[PDB]
Amino acid sequence: ARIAGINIPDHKHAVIALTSIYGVGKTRSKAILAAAGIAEDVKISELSEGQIDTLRDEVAKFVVEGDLRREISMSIKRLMDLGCYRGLRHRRGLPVRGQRTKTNARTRKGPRKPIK
Amino acid sequence: RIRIRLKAFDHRLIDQATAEIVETAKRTGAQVRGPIPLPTRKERFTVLISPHVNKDARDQYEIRTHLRLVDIVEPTEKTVDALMRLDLAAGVDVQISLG
């Protein structure tokens, strides 16, 4: 009920609850439960500490929040100080995968700034 | 057995042609199955008719490829030489296939 240093929900099913960890989605959660021999429909409550310990050992094999944010930020920072096109686009805060920018770039640009 | 496939853009012409084929087979030899009508392929196209800008002004054309199938169950020599030497009107495409 506490995995990877964060508290995961309890009333939720195990396969859903595991996704709360930064670095684990639905498929990775399924793979974890399969390796640990735990059914997907069981909740985080009414589950033994030994099973939860097996879950911790299984999740340890992957990369989760602590080093994942560090490496993601490191890659983004790498691009920016590297001076590549993606770096310049990142520092300017615009879409980097070659999207249109004349309109529909709201997620990277935030809410509209009116002309003054 | 010998199979003949007729393709044409004019249905009246293909009907006349297939009637001629079954007649010319029936005269020299015999045992022609009959003039089977195969499905007509309607190939359609849609083109813009304005030279510069009118997206809602278009023409819808089609090319109907009519098809006919005839075959001789057991062909003789006086059947096969005759149909080889015989020629038909332009616009009809014949396809000889033995076996």
């Binding site: 590549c84 096109y85 993606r86 | -």
Partner: protein, 83 residues
Amino acid sequence: PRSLKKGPFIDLHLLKKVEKAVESGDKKPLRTWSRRSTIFPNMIGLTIAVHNGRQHVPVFVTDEMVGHKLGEFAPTRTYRGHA
């Protein structure tokens, strides 16, 4: 990106040029228009003037630029704001 089984792409003229450069050890900037070529380990420490449509921008190749294409470090759009 390019499929792994086909290998990386680099123009033959640029390949010969970087070979001559690393052999003679000269330090003059190699000007080129080859924006579509990937960086190889021997090109580290060299200055290559990649074309940007108007001029030949000089870029100093470091060890952190190997897996990228040269054109990423020579931006072609010039923009300074609207206001």
